Amino acid sequence: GGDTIFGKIIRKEIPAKIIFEDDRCLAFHDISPQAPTHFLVIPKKHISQISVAEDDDESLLGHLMIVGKKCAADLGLNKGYRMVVNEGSDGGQSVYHVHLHVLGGRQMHWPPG
Protein backbone atom coordinates (compact mmCIF):
# COMPACT_ATOMS: atom_id res chain seq x y z
CA GLY A 1 0.00 0.00 0.00
CA GLY A 2 2.26 2.75 1.30
CA ASP A 3 -0.60 5.11 2.14
CA THR A 4 -1.38 6.59 5.57
CA ILE A 5 -3.36 5.13 8.44
CA PHE A 6 -6.37 7.17 7.37
CA GLY A 7 -5.99 6.08 3.76
CA LYS A 8 -6.18 2.56 5.14
CA ILE A 9 -9.30 3.40 7.17
CA ILE A 10 -10.96 4.74 4.01
CA ARG A 11 -10.20 1.50 2.15
CA LYS A 12 -11.27 -0.60 5.17
CA GLU A 13 -7.76 -2.06 5.61
CA ILE A 14 -7.50 -0.67 9.15
CA PRO A 15 -10.63 -0.90 11.31
CA ALA A 16 -12.50 2.02 12.79
CA LYS A 17 -15.80 2.78 14.49
CA ILE A 18 -17.42 5.03 11.92
CA ILE A 19 -20.08 7.43 13.19
CA PHE A 20 -20.80 9.34 9.98
CA GLU A 21 -20.19 8.62 6.32
CA ASP A 22 -21.26 10.36 3.13
CA ASP A 23 -19.84 10.57 -0.39
CA ARG A 24 -17.16 13.09 0.73
CA CYS A 25 -15.98 12.17 4.22
CA LEU A 26 -15.91 9.83 7.21
CA ALA A 27 -15.96 10.44 10.95
CA PHE A 28 -14.70 7.97 13.54
CA HIS A 29 -13.64 7.76 17.14
CA ASP A 30 -10.01 8.53 17.96
CA ILE A 31 -8.05 5.49 19.17
CA SER A 32 -6.22 7.57 21.78
CA PRO A 33 -8.96 9.85 23.14
CA GLN A 34 -7.98 12.99 25.01
CA ALA A 35 -11.50 13.82 26.21
CA PRO A 36 -14.64 11.82 27.01
CA THR A 37 -15.67 12.46 23.40
CA HIS A 38 -12.87 12.62 20.84
CA PHE A 39 -13.48 11.87 17.18
CA LEU A 40 -11.92 12.71 13.82
CA VAL A 41 -13.51 13.87 10.59
CA ILE A 42 -11.56 13.11 7.40
CA PRO A 43 -12.12 13.66 3.68
CA LYS A 44 -12.19 10.65 1.40
CA LYS A 45 -10.00 12.69 -0.97
CA HIS A 46 -6.32 12.44 -0.08
CA ILE A 47 -4.71 15.75 0.84
CA SER A 48 -1.52 15.24 2.83
CA GLN A 49 -1.84 18.26 5.12
CA ILE A 50 -3.69 21.54 5.38
CA SER A 51 -0.65 23.49 4.13
CA VAL A 52 -1.05 21.91 0.67
CA ALA A 53 -4.84 22.13 0.43
CA GLU A 54 -6.07 24.15 -2.55
CA ASP A 55 -8.62 26.91 -3.03
CA ASP A 56 -11.11 24.55 -4.60
CA ASP A 57 -10.95 22.35 -1.47
CA GLU A 58 -12.70 25.08 0.55
CA SER A 59 -16.14 23.49 0.38
CA LEU A 60 -14.72 20.10 1.40
CA LEU A 61 -12.80 21.57 4.33
CA GLY A 62 -15.88 23.43 5.54
CA HIS A 63 -17.86 20.23 5.11
CA LEU A 64 -15.54 18.58 7.66
CA MET A 65 -16.47 21.27 10.18
CA ILE A 66 -20.20 20.98 9.46
CA VAL A 67 -20.01 17.20 9.82
CA GLY A 68 -18.06 17.76 13.04
CA LYS A 69 -20.92 19.96 14.25
CA LYS A 70 -23.52 17.34 13.35
CA CYS A 71 -21.60 14.53 15.01
CA ALA A 72 -20.99 16.61 18.15
CA ALA A 73 -24.73 17.17 18.43
CA ASP A 74 -25.44 13.46 17.88
CA LEU A 75 -22.98 12.62 20.67
CA GLY A 76 -24.63 15.08 23.06
CA LEU A 77 -21.93 17.77 23.26
CA ASN A 78 -24.40 20.45 24.33
CA LYS A 79 -21.89 22.22 26.58
CA GLY A 80 -19.45 22.79 23.70
CA TYR A 81 -16.29 21.36 22.17
CA ARG A 82 -13.02 22.22 20.47
CA MET A 83 -12.01 21.55 16.88
CA VAL A 84 -8.33 21.13 16.01
CA VAL A 85 -6.17 20.69 12.93
CA ASN A 86 -2.51 19.70 13.44
CA GLU A 87 -0.10 20.78 10.67
CA GLY A 88 3.44 19.51 10.38
CA SER A 89 6.11 19.08 12.99
CA ASP A 90 5.19 22.00 15.27
CA GLY A 91 1.51 21.05 15.03
CA GLY A 92 2.44 17.57 16.19
CA GLN A 93 0.95 16.02 13.04
CA SER A 94 1.29 12.20 13.00
CA VAL A 95 -0.95 11.19 10.11
CA TYR A 96 -0.37 12.97 6.80
CA HIS A 97 -3.95 12.89 5.53
CA VAL A 98 -5.90 16.08 6.36
CA HIS A 99 -8.33 15.73 9.26
CA LEU A 100 -10.19 17.58 11.97
CA HIS A 101 -10.31 16.61 15.66
CA VAL A 102 -13.43 17.28 17.73
CA LEU A 103 -13.02 17.05 21.52
CA GLY A 104 -15.65 17.53 24.21
CA GLY A 105 -17.26 16.24 27.36
CA ARG A 106 -14.87 18.13 29.64
CA GLN A 107 -13.64 21.67 30.09
CA MET A 108 -10.97 22.35 27.48
CA HIS A 109 -8.02 24.42 28.74
CA TRP A 110 -5.88 27.23 27.31
CA PRO A 111 -3.45 27.42 25.58
CA PRO A 112 -4.60 24.65 23.23
CA GLY A 113 -1.29 22.87 23.61
Q: What distance in Å separates the CA atoms of residue 65 and residue 58, rounded to the nearest whole number?
A: 11
State the minimum distance, in angstroms, from the CB of residue 47 to ligand D5M. Answer: 13
Does residue 99 have an active-site annotation?
Answer: yes
Contacts of 93 (CB under 8 A, 6+ apart): 49, 86, 87
Among 44, 86, 95, 96, binds its own copies (CB under 8 A): 86
Catalytic residue, from 38, 63, 97, 99: name it.
99
Q: Kindly list the strands in the beta sheet with 37-43, ordered across the sheet, starting from the edge strand earlier in the chain.
A: 18-21, 25-29, 37-43, 100-104
- Residue 92 annotated as part of some ligand binding site: yes
> Cβ distance 71 to 39 under 8 Å?
yes
- Binding flags for its own copies, 33-62, as an x/- string (CB under 8 A): -xx--------------xx-xxx-xxxxxx
Nearest residue to ligand D5M by CB is: 94
Residue 69 within binding range of its own copies, rule CB under 8 A:
yes
H/E stretch holding 37: strand 37-43
- Residue 30 annotated as part of some ligand binding site: yes
Burial class (CB in 10 A: 0-12, 13-18, 19+), 22: exposed
State the minimum distance, in angstroms, from the CB of residue 13 to ligand D5M. Answer: 10
Catalogue the active-site residues: 99
- Report the interface residues with its own copies, using CB under 8 A: 34-35, 50-51, 53-55, 57-63, 65-66, 68-69, 72-73, 77, 79-93, 101, 103-113
